[PDB]
Amino acid sequence: LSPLHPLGCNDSEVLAVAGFALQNINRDQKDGYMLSLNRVHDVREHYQEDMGSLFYLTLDVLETDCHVLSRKAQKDCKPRMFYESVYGQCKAMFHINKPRRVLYLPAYNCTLRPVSKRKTHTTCPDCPSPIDLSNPSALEAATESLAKFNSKSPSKKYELVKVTKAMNQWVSGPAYYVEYLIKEAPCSDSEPVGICQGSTVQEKSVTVTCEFFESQSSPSVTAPRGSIQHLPELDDPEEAFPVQLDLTTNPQGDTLDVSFLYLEPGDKKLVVLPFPGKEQRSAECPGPEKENNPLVLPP
Ligand SMILES: *[C@@H]1O[C@H](CO)[C@@H](O)[C@H](O)[C@H]1NC(C)=O
Ligand SMILES: *[C@@H]1O[C@H](CO)[C@@H](O)[C@H](O)[C@H]1NC(C)=O
């Protein structure tokens, strides 16, 4: 819109604010895996001269192998390898006010898809393959791996919560690799306490390892309402990952009260517009991709 000024997707301020917004998104999640920033696809800034700025960000993201509940650092979590890749886009409306040292993510939304199995097969026909999380063999691997893990826990026993990842490959026979969350068995409540990796091969041979969540803080404070949705593969560009982020459908613009961020009690209102479309985009957008390793890139 008229007050929405486009910015270059490679600008330091833009990339820093994008990092803040994405770590806020990750903190706001309690399901799935931590997202990683590949680049800023587009960015518009609404400057408001004492209420700071509001950035309308379009982000190209990749799923890592860290579960969000691990709360690990962005630098201990790398994008998944290409045959199990999950990618898409997030839109975020991020508010920053430098003189007052205020950060806030009033709204976001992400749309992700797993990489097309056809493209994977084209580039690596013998690679491991993701499978449905409800696959009987995946559920069996989870069950038996957790059974073994409990067998070697004298006092504490754990129960399955949900399979979060499943994969099939050939290791001198059919093999299934799964990840799943575990909770403490009633003996404390029914909340995820860790994530386990389970495996079956070939009368099956079983392996199991578990990681328990610990506390973890970084340059990002709060992240209200938003959602991450997972759509199916592309059977076969722009609008491959449709994302709606409309706090207001009013071209006039609405006002959002953010007084809780500032020391004074009242009269701190932020102008919000409908999220800007792809036209009037800076020639420096989209920015340069950070992942150039084809071992982690989607086609
Ligand atoms: C992006 O900015 C960095 C400096 O932070 C520069 O080294 C790099 O060449 C830029 N890439 C562009 C403009 O594509
Ligand atoms: C975020 O996406 C959901 C659909 O997954 C949609 O219902 C919701 O309105 C979106 N949020 C905004 C602020 O538009």
Author numbering: 31 to 217, 229 to 243, 256 to 269, 296 to 315, 326 to 388
Copied sentences from the primary study:
Fetuin-B is a highly selective and potent inhibitor of metallo­peptidases (MPs) of the astacin family, which includes ovastacin in mammals. By inhibiting ovastacin, fetuin-B is essential for female fertility. The crystal structure of fetuin-B was determined unbound and in complex with archetypal astacin, and it was found that the inhibitor has tandem cystatin-type modules (CY1 and CY2). They are connected by an exposed linker with a rigid, disulfide-linked ‘CPDCP-trunk’, and are followed by a C-terminal region (CTR) with little regular secondary structure.
Examination of the crystal packing of the protein expressed in mammalian cells explains why it crystallized in its unbound form, whereas the material produced in insect cells did not: endoglycosidase H processing of the high-mannose N-glycans of the HEK293S-derived protein (a step performed during purification) left a single N-acetyl­glucosamine moiety attached to N40 that stacks against W200 of a symmetry-related molecule. This introduces a crucial crystal-packing contact that would most likely be hindered by the presence of additional sugar residues attached to the core N-acetylglucosamine, such as those normally found in proteins expressed in insect cells. The respective cores comprising CY1+LNK+CY2 are undefined for both the tip of hairpin II and Lβ8β9 of CY2, and they superpose with an r.m.s.d. of 1.7 Å. CY1 and CY2 are just rotated by ∼10° with respect to each other when going from the unbound to the complexed structure. The only functionally relevant differences in the cores are found at the tips of hairpins I and II of CY2 [inset in Fig. 1(e)], which however are very likely to result from crystal contacts in the unbound structure. Hairpin I is in a noncompetent conformation for binding, and becomes folded out towards the CPDCP-trunk upon complex formation.
